[PDB]
Design a binder for this molecule. Sequence first.
Ligand SMILES: O=P(O)(O)O[C@H]1[C@@H](OP(=O)(O)O)[C@@H](OP(=O)(O)O)[C@@H](OP(=O)(O)O)[C@@H](OP(=O)(O)O)[C@H]1OP(=O)(O)O
Length: 336
Amino acid sequence: APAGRQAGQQATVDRLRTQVTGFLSGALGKLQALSAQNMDPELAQFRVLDVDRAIMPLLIVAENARNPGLNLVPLHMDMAEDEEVRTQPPMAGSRHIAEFVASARPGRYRAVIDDGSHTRAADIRKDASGTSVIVVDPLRKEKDESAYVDYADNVNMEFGEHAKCAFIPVDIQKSFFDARILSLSLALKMHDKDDAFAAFHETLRNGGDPSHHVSRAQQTEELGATLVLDGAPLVDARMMKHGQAASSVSRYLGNHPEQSTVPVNKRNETLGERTTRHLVKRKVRNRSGETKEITFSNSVEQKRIALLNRAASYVNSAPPPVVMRMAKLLQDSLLD
Ligand SMILES: O=P(O)(O)O[C@H]1[C@@H](OP(=O)(O)O)[C@@H](OP(=O)(O)O)[C@@H](OP(=O)(O)O)[C@@H](OP(=O)(O)O)[C@H]1OP(=O)(O)O
């Protein structure tokens, strides 16, 4: 019985359910039309940044329910609280990292971390001894690879200096707007590789040799954070699935040939097979002239759509308190 679980608000719950599915379905429809027509969202004046920021807390709820133990939490860094620098306020329900680390129950967490303009994924472990975190950044655009040293130290600082930290920049993102969806995907993969990340957490906490987990690593020697400039095999083929540039995927396989024959999904595709299937040629904004035509993988825009599909299905049959919480999260996206 549904009425048993409705607590006398069947009318309110029903309307709020329709309201939430209505939004998810609306976004989904627009994003699907754009993808089906091989159209770049920015050039089409679709504001993905706003749509992603609004749907992201709802995706987190759906994914946490869909995978018990994922324990995905949205977090933000200090600079995300700066109204004058940040590109967007943090998503609804986002917690300040310092506040989270302080009060969080001990356990295993995933996170998407917002700095005000960019989002990364993270795997977090807090217990009596302290907190350890492994950050994977889907973006790797720095010319001089010394800037990553600073990134590693800054994250370690957010978690405090007695927290163990690993920072792994990966060349996945090429577009301006895909950080959120890529980070959510990376977070999910972390839960999928729970054991592998747990093992890395132990090495961090015990100060052992990182090369049991990753191929290239170094100490910042300012905070002691481990900067990982080559995550394989911790960063395996499955974590490279949504690589936007064909050359990023190719270069990765060229550098780690052993990754080229492992199946990345249940249909038994290799990374190269799957990536090739997602290749499209379309105009994108250049950042003279305004637009530039490129060939790249549309895997991320498909993933966004798949995530929405999941989320909507979940909402359609979700219990009333969950509907209530997601409706609220949707409303709260308009407060800052
Ligand atoms: O990380 P998840 O959200 O849980 O999704 C992944 C994955 O999607 P990714 O590309 O992001 O890795 C696969 O999908 P694709 O390779 O086709 O894109 C897969 O689907 P298939 O194995 O059937 O191909 C399946 O999602 P689903 O079972 O809902 O279709 C899967 O989940 P798991 O990795 O947890 O098993």
